[model samples]
Target: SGAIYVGNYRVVNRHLATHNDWANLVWEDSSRDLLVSSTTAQGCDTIARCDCQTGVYYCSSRRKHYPVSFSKPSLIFVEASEYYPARYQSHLMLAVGHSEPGDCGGILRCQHGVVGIVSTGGNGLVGFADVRDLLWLDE
Candidate 1:
């Protein structure tokens, strides 16, 4: 499959009934088949996934704040010293710059405009334990 970024329509929203809708994805039901999750992970729901099975294989826990967990056992742990550059409209891929929290690794600044991606560890919220395995997305 393409690169799954725990993006929108990736998970259900039943879990939103109790958690912060802006910071997390909620399951629409117990089956966990329906989702109302978001696209970004920074400052939002730290946890994100494509589905139950996908979670078991790729994301296991929220150990890495910016867990770009791949299906190939590869993960991109964002440190607090790196940030995305503030320019991208011209190019698709932007370089990660350094900021305060980023100077330490707080969130990932995507190459695009305001559109970015980030990772999260785990919270008290319930759902897929984590990605089952690791996979890679190629160009």
Candidate 2:
């Protein structure tokens, strides 16, 4: 209800896709890289949370592998944690852009707030499990 919780939750992909431990996550944006020349200049104004609707704001993921394709004119980036892209888990990853397999389940952040996890992608669309669907968030 307040700040989005971090680390581990009861998460799921599609109906057939179920998991007792699908909620592995991280909220610390410290690993995030900004193009902004100076750290002070980069506002770091990521909101407290994200709007329910998708594509409301611009977003990006790390240079992980491509599980699939992203939307149109997709060629920008928001540097997420490098270690963030583990080969395990749902790759509840990371984007709405030209992401790759290794990049799966990296992290997608917008100015709005912590948004969703990269779930799956097809038909030029990426499925991000809503961070709002979280059961619990913790330290």
Candidate 3:
């Protein structure tokens, strides 16, 4: 199983969805399946699987995956700092960089680009809580 990083969440045992090739992810919460597109250039949705039974919380194509959970709270901080080189001293930056907040979200800037920190309740607005957890292609 390949490791695909979507934001701070480390999606283990990753796979791709069938058909096409353009880089995408389809996450099925009920089945706990995270469908990943082409690993190579223009790799479209061709794989499907899930690392956790709890479903994908968030994802990004560029960022590295960091396995974190409330179960082992200590690991969250340790893994977060090591996940990226950018400094997240401010609270907003921290949330955007690694922490998942319930409300009052913000954004964090990395060497790659800006990452949106959405409130837990705003999952629908950002498509995080959708049936298909498709990743936006990096263009």
Candidate 4:
């Protein structure tokens, strides 16, 4: 999987195939308080914690050969925080559109009925970026 969970935050690729070299993640303190740590196969590790009381967020990541850890401490601005959830939910909605009338895992349908998922509502660019775009290109 190209995603990891540290604490309440869901750390996913900023774009597909954005392995250890570069990746982005977003998290909103939704449920239980947690301090989570994880490392990727590409030599990346992170320690993150969320304090529900003050809604403060902090995390540190150590890259492959980084001498010092990169750390950030921030107060969650509702405005910024709210934007992510909206986008996330919108993605979920798009996913539901591809799902059939299965209340409990009945029929799963894609665009070609078995080939791909639903469209993105305009020219057919649905959800996230394509993984092929993340591949190393020939110079």
Candidate 5:
């Protein structure tokens, strides 16, 4: 039910792990098919945040791939930091050179021209989300 679609057409929500949506052609669904749920003391990482399935099996809840959760870049130098998420909607992609709560929705001008209007703040080197983030483009 979490699947993303467009007028009944299904597309990849996020690029799959190592599959990269590139020429490699890895078409496995990381969550619904290629992961093992239960774990033990060997062959996998069991810490919930980084857990890996060690069993030779497949289950939905516990099956997910990490690297496959990122998105493809739209503009050449504007790679987004996101998960399971786009082709192109833009609100600027530069990092906040100096972050403060004030940066949120703040505006700046250069040479009598508006250069930027900040929307969010991060660790001073991060942006929150999106290539449009696909689904978020909808109301």
Candidate 6:
């Protein structure tokens, strides 16, 4: 009922909600606009907020017809490729974090626990993103 791979990542449940597309997610923090997107510049679908006082993921959706809602006090973001969010395939995404090739040869050290997984796409060697953020890597 959980992980299905070396990284111990949770397998994508097709029946769950989707958020694979959409660009330019802006959240307000201290009157400054914070931009949240994949490092790749594609876009994001799912958005979440964690209580600054209580860390927990509470999800939210994007409405095309409404104005942005950065008025809230807390917000986090998730996104995918350009053509995503199109087919409701928002569940399928390119994760921003994964295992890294180890310092010594032939060792794999993955830093972040799986936040999401690849639900669809071509088969190939597992790719990892080179991220420098402590937010996703540390906690």
lDDT of each: 0.25, 0.33, 0.26, 0.21, 0.26, 0.21
The lDDT of model 3 is 0.26
lDDT of 5: 0.26
Ranking by TM-score: 2, 5, 6, 4, 1, 3
C-alpha-based local distance difference test score of model 6: 0.21
Off by over 4 Å in 1: 1-18, 22-27, 38-56, 59-139
lDDT by residue (24-136, candidate 2, tens digit) is: 32222212211111111223323334343434322245324333332322123322333334223221333345533333343445445655445444444554444533323
**What is the alpha-carbon lDDT for the whole of candidate 1?**
0.25
Alpha-carbon shift of residue 75 in model 6 (angstroms): 18
Off by over 4 Å in 4: 1-81, 84-96, 99-126, 137-139
Candidate 6, 1-139: lDDT as tens digits: 1111221111222222125312322221211111122233222222122311111111112111111111112122322434234232211222222222221011111222222322222232222111112143222
Off by over 4 Å in 3: 1-25, 28-105, 116-136
Better of 2 and 4 by lDDT: 2
TM-score of 2: 0.34
Cα deviation of 35, candidate 4, in Å: 21
TM-score top scorer:
2
Error of 4 at 27 (Å): 18
Residues 20-139 of candidate 5 have per-residue lDDT tens digits of: 333333233322111111112223111111112111111122332111111222231222435323233233333424444333323222222222223233554322122122332122
Error at 127, model 6, angstroms = 10
Clashes of 2: 16
Which is superior by TM-score, 2 or 4?
2
Find the number of clashing residue pairs for candidate 3: 18
Listed in order, each prediction's TM-score against the native is 0.19, 0.34, 0.18, 0.19, 0.25, 0.19
CA RMSD of each candidate after superposition: 16.1, 13.6, 15.5, 19.1, 18.9, 18.3
Q: Positional deviation of 70 in candidate 1, in angstroms?
A: 17
